[model samples]
Target chain A: IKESVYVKSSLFSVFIFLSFYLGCLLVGFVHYLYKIYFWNIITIAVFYALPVIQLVITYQTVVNVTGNQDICYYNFLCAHPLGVLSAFNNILSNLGHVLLGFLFLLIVLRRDILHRRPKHFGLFYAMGIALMMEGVLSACYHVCPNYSNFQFDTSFMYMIAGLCMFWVIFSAIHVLASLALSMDRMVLLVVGNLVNWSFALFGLIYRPRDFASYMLGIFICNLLLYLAFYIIMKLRSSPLFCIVATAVMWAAALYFFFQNLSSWEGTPAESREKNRECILLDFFDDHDIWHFLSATALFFSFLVL
Target chain B: IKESVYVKSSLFSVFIFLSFYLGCLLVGFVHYLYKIYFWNIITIAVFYALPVIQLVITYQTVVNVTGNQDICYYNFLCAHPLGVLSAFNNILSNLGHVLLGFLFLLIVLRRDILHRRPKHFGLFYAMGIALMMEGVLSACYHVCPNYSNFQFDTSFMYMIAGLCMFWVIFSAIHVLASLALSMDRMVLLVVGNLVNWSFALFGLIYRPRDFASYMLGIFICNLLLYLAFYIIMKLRSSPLFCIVATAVMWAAALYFFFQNLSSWEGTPAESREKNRECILLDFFDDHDIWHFLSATALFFSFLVL
Candidate 1:
């Protein structure tokens, strides 16, 4: 039998890899300078830096597999030097991506920020699946350009299918994990409502900045609103429905506040410098500012309640 | 009327000013380094650095003033270059001390973070007052070391009192500004809580990661447990109370996790390189990983609902 044909090597592939890597490198250098000269604007620097880094790593990995002697060469050819460079770059670039992913994952998981909702749970799983699919597909494409076509060759297809299947499975698992976090948040909200209401009447008289005082007011408000809404919706009889409704409402509210607001403002270049000064001063003050803000808010909420 | 019996020739006074100015210059250099390398760890570097820079400027100003004979000096005293340097240094040093006191006041007024709490407000005011008093007393002592023993000279006492009063007014403004920032945080918290939940859910469902499948199962299980608790608590009357309870619980859980599981089990120095690698990788992949985890948790909750 004759050997399979290969595609002609193109400079476009090498250019893609080089451009992506170099772009990311420039971004990284900029971020370093920003940290030095404009410490206050961390959020802005991070927003700009992250996407560039991701593209660099993803492209580097994908481009490297083309010129290999494996099955990938049968479909798409790449220069040997370009192939090696891409692979090496993949290792270099992903170092940051992987590390950042794990750190943020641990923070979200451990922070109990979740406010449980079924939709949230669903969304979480979908994301995991997407990530897994992307990671695996990119990896395979790097290793085997003819992966999709190789399916006709039963043996190669089976192997590739297994790998793809693994990605799908992982994605499914991610959805499951997200569901758990949402559930946790819902439970916390419910418990907090009751405990908070017990002190609500007294909290109304307290100052706004006091944490304990404001929480008391918030508790009462939440309870009254929740009961009014639940009874009106006729969800009281069905415990499961009530739970789901509350979860959804809370999740919606949380979504608006956290994602919409927190993500809305990008840390500006000017702010970065100010942030450094603020951070330094705040640090020396032993984070007393946070405590003060918490206490004062708590005290003042009493009036509104 | 006769210049309040001013000293005709005081070598000790001149020497003191020179020493104080030199001290300011040295302190400023230290502050520059601290800002560049250790600002993250210590917040007071700028507060300290500014004074030193001011002193250097003031010293130069005094030299100019003396060269122009703005202040009276004997012919012999004016002829000696060393005497001129000492006299100017003394004058500048004294002025620098006064400026330092005022700078502290300005810093307090301009930065909200510095004065975030009511309790600290009084403490910070007191510190400023103390600095002012110290400056005035030092200035008085420079002019009349024996004034205390002879209560007849009230002019020196009045000068000290005048400077102290100026500082007291500045301190009052600083206190009021700090109070405002404390109140703002209360409003921010409510908004922050809601936004955080939505983002968490959104991120979980949409974000992609490399090791999605391997971690999916555990992620889902934990997510579900989290949601279950959320649902149960929300069903109760006071949701705000439940939220607070949940936060407390999570705080404890986090404390335990960090103390027992997350903490270095042995000497960190022995495994420093590995730890660093782990940190780097985690940071790089933070955003994507967070999205993956949130998605996983959200998926399971969706199924349950």
Candidate 2:
């Protein structure tokens, strides 16, 4: 009787894995298409060039370099042409970093993986390697040439650290997802909603000065989208997940709907500085987003098991 | 079997009542002898005359009137001539009240008298009437005689109230004593001792300055003496009565030992005033000696039952 029971359990496990893996693949494909076709060319390029464009237009209007300008005007004009392109490249690199984070999550979930397994453990290390490669490639391309030195600065190191933390969190969530249907659904929905709302609110109120925040925003939003999908599929047995997802959706919608009104207020340097400090501190703090997510995922994983 | 049991119970009840009555008479006789022979006759007389003596002394001292002094001095000298006779009367009166209280307990204990008999309740009423008469006579003779007038006064009213309260309390103790042996014996002993000690202490300290307090002290002392006798005889089966009685004896000895020292403290007007208040308040206050004695007596009474 035990042998028969074990056999039946093994068969059921196989059927569940097949369906779960298929769903992960389909989600990954859709995300990839969205990133490559729309985000990479349009959103990344526009945000990347915005700061340089604003600087140039202000200089032109103030200096009258385009009409009866001095000999130095030629040099200013020559330098200004490359400025917008440099800004665009910088934005694209940041966007790539964000896109890579999502891809890492997809890859981790596509395979039936546990952090305890050797193969699954290597995926996190691979994430660190991938983040470093992207930072080096962006620096080589002279993205944001004015701030090219940042390629070797602590910011790049932070980016790598943040990506590594993200990978650890992603691996934990994947493990939890495989444990119990109810708990896995709840965790993804709750965590995804919180991160999405936080990012959307941040974005609506304060425009990102560089690629880093923008990319982080994209990664948060995509993760939330995936979570919403998971909740919707599991809603029959997990109504709580659907409720949490709905709250997240409402928060995101509110942010977008009120985005234009936020522009009415001029940016204060002190506010921007405080925002930067907060983001950096949150990134370094052990109890920040990544740690919270990983801990939550682990807790629910135990509950499900 | 039923007939034999009934006969046995009737015989037991009669025997218990007789033993209790004898015990009361014995205790009352001993107390009378101790007061008459051992205690200072002059001091006892003076103490009883305290209320009237205090009023005359206070008026003379406050007004510094020679007439008041002459009248008080003359009264004191006259009272001195009859001091021994007055002391004998006081002792006899106290003995009489104690016997009267005992008779009430005896009547209550009689199965033939109290068993479902409404008219027998008059025994308690008779005790009350006897107590009132004793209190009034004692106050008039020993407390109000030296006062310029026995007309209404705070001290006179207080004495009346205290005496009446004492009678009510004695009646309660008699009722408890008449109860079945199912009641605790140690409680009864302790309560009896406490009430006796309180009355003694109040008399020794307050030295009643009016007929009211004077009568109150006498009534309370008489009640305690009767209650002690009732419990000792009825709850003989329990050692608690003996233990409480021993404690009461020790307390009485200690008070006697300290009595001289307490008297030596030069009398303050305020101290005298406080003593009067204490006498009146102690009966009402649960911390009073009466409560302690009653509690201990009732405890023993219950234990015996």
Candidate 3:
């Protein structure tokens, strides 16, 4: 059994490698095709390259280069100019979201639509796409670290948090729909995306800027409750095992949260320590801890979910 | 089937409520028992109330208070002398960890003489006990916001991060041991706990104060690579689904790493925001964003792992 799974994963990794190369090839072709001006390719070009291209253009003329804001955003690093390697971190991370979006798009396309349970299947579609936008905007925010970009970054975080809640609602509706009626995939897709984005945008507009934490807390709590619900109610997963997993995840996350909180609670001496650039390595710092812990916690939460 | 699941979930919710109350009552009994000097109950009392007790003592006699540090450490909230609500945010969150640890401890105690795949069953014992120390130390750090507490909090964070890597190593070893040779649970438990704690202690002693971030990053990458490795291997989960989940987690983390890096890259004027406090709520500010985003990221990561 273990050997079979290993072989399966090896094959899957190859599939991933081929698909990546295929994506690059498609992009290469699209670049050539852009000489003739296809609107579709043009749109893609605009989305992908706009920021990078715009930065070069703006660097020459715009005086907002020092867009002067002083505040630590995420991951406890102080501010500096957007250097090349620095953006690499967010770029790769955001690419993950974009990658997932495409992967889900493939999955959705492969499925037999309603025959495989469309509402359930379409959740991934919304998740993939929403996260792609979130990742791109996040990367953009990191590139600029200006008020506008910060807005985009935190708002996107909120949207993604809402996305978790969106899953719970969808699952509940999925349960209801099976008994009550048939549901539309397009509607499922639209509603799912909207539910996630809507709550986020609403919070963005109506609430104060720092509302991301509440949304985050809400989402985690909601996800936990859903996990509990699924465990007892007979979901596809084992309840006992999942509860333990969720509990482990819960500890790590709150650990991350408090560690982060305590970081901000550092003494004058420690705060000074945070500002001193590592002579040993320019690429990493304490925020990296939060980043990694959050990921580990997320990894476990996915299992619990 | 769906209807029955929903009904089951509703019943499960009730069960959770009852269980929570039951746990609370047991704690209440344990506290009363501690008055009689029972060693077990005394241990529980010491573990749970140490931080809270320390804070009260520290608040009175210890004089190294910092109403002065206006800079950021991990998150972006500036502090004042013993601001009640601000401190409350941390205390409650720390309580979450304490709750999870206790919950796991209960599960471990409920298990039959470690008969349920002892390697797997005992992971919780380590996780539960480890996080309890972590949470207490964290809460203590926040309460004082002094230098010693800062050391304690960050060090414990290192220890818990070590604990996760400890689990990864133990799991891998457990897998290998099943094929290669025999192992003892007592030996497993003792070595596992020590490996996690010893390095954390060594780092605390060998390195200067701000070494917490490095340990965090090392463990995260360690965890991620292990996750990626596990995706290629087989366990209690699917390789494909878990891989995508891990990919999502890896992205969010680096994304966070870069976002934080970009925070420091802010134009000088904008860079000043890190120093400012939220007048609307001293309890919140930019650090809250990290807390939320990190938690959200963790929620997804749970699914991935």
Candidate 4:
């Protein structure tokens, strides 16, 4: 059973892994937060360069830069080996992120031209580019999954989370400051981010092992709650069609996101048992639907913003 | 090895327990926050009466009203059977909480008489009473520790955390508002508590099994951070002696708190291996030092307020 792999590790080793995982996550999030909020000029450029930097560092450090496909987790139902990539369908599904990301970038570009506003143009650009990068990086990670190449998929996720969280919190704080008397304007901002970071920290403290998926869950909750409030207050300013589309897309996206088609929580052998035949079509699985719907959701989310 | 007990549990069982624990913590924190801020009359009374209510429920429900001493975790170094309580040293150490809690109450009462202000007096009373109750209930729990009696020691902790957080944040918010404009007063409060509770929630999500000690760690971090800011802003309003003493006491308390004297993370049999000889007098161990120092810290913390 998969439990054997878990049981074989000593408690001390678990503690060590837990510490390293937690430390890396905390440091990364804090760094990304600083990079997004504080840095300007070449900020977006630096963000874009991270995946390549990781690739270089990973290749130098690990003997196997080309991931051991045998060890990777995938939806076996639609993951029949047909090309250079073992999980061709899973790799192919990432086209959703790449395609929609380009669409989002175009939308942002046109909006910038029309509005000519600098207020949040930078952030919009960052997010759109991040979405595009996420698809390519995620595909690279899935090509051969292991610790050596794991960050390829996750680096951009952190960027997106930071961007989304910062955007929503900034909007909420403004609305908040206006509603009340401008008592402690800076305090409101400081307190808001402190709480948000603390909340993020708390999640890492619990399940550092499930860092990617679990943090996504937390980010979504925060995003949805704040966005709901923002939508209610800014109904007139919002694009009604975009809001409705985003809602429907996210609803479907979450359904696929939670389908649990496969998990890395246990041993590869044990985890494979959870995989099933493709639920969507001959070419895609539940997670692939997640990719498609979530990309659509992001596109609409950007439009609403 | 103690690991056997941990390894025996199925992953599904862990998930079930994790969910229940996380849900209960979320509900309790939210409810308590509301009760403290929104409810005034009988609030302190309700807070004080929780332990008694727990006792009544426990006595009626649990077949073993007297805990199975064999299953409890205690410092064997100081735990020599001498009377009705198996772990007499552990139970006796709780006098720290009871005695200092009363001292805090007296201090609050005198301050109330001198100042005659309506602001925060109720919260002060609640915290003092809760501290006193914590000692008694904690002693009760240590007499024969297990799941059935665990909440006795923990119920007041939540109250203290809520009261302390509310007080510091309230102070911080007012200060914050004055520094800026009188903006979004309600949002600041809502946001502050939301972050605090969310931070609390994140801790539980990770290690629900280590609910008590782990939560304490998180609470202390939040409490100290906000309180430091409060002290800095209201240095003139604060008593220097109390501040210094609280700092010294907490430093000492944390030393013992993290001493790894014992843990309930494994089976009772395995957990017992962590026991050690008395570090204080023939009667007290490292945890006894924690009990003593933490209570004193609370006393000093209240005085600063």
Give the lDDT of residue B121 in candidate 3. 42
Interface RMSD of 3: 22.8
Tens-place lDDT digits, model 1, residues A1-305: 01111121123323434464576468557966912222222232232223223433433444454433332221111122234343221222222222323332333343334453222333233232333223333333333223221121122222222223243453345334323323565665566554443444333444233242243334435544555555545754662443444444444333322211111022222222322121211121111222222222322221112
Model 1 bad stretches (over 4 Å):
A1-112, A115-305, B1-47, B50-305
Instruction: State in Å the error of residue A108, model 4.
Output: 1.8
Tens-place lDDT per residue, model 4, A1-305, is 13343234223333543564476458557966824332331343343344344433343333234454444566666664543445666666676677667656665666667785435677767666667667777766666555534543564454454335344454455345333422564765565566565555555445345556755765575566567758755775764877888889999999877767676657777678888786543556787778778877877776777
Native contacts recovered, each model: 0.00, 0.00, 0.00, 0.00
| lDDT values for all models | 0.33, 0.37, 0.44, 0.59
Candidate ordering by lDDT (highest first): 4, 3, 2, 1
> On residues A106-134, what C-alpha lDDT tens digit does candidate 3 reach at each position?
64555535364623544444454554565
DockQ of each: 0.00, 0.00, 0.01, 0.01
lDDT of 3 at B126: 52
**Interface RMSD for each of the candidates:** 33.3, 50.3, 22.8, 21.2
Q: Which candidate model has the greater lDDT, 2 or 3?
A: 3
When summed lDDT is taken over every stretch of 10 residues in candidate 4 chain B, the lowest stretch is: B1-10
Please provide, for model 3 over B1-305, each residue's C-alpha lDDT reduced to its tens digit, 9 standing for 90 to 100.
23454345335533544576596579657966912223322343243334334433444342334443222132334433233333344443344445545655665565534464423544445544565666565555555343323443554444334324344464455344333322565775455455545554554455533444545654664455455555545653652554565556456545644333213233433544545454323343343234333433443344343
The C-alpha stretches of model 3 lying farther than 4 A from their native spots are A1-119, A156-209, A235-250, A258-283, A292-305, B1-305
Candidates, ranked, TM-score: 4, 3, 2, 1
What value does the lDDT take at residue B80 in candidate 1? 22
User: What DockQ results for candidate 4?
Assistant: 0.01
User: TM per model?
Assistant: 0.15, 0.16, 0.29, 0.35
What's the residue-level lDDT of A174 in candidate 2? 36
Q: Which candidate is the best by lDDT?
A: 4
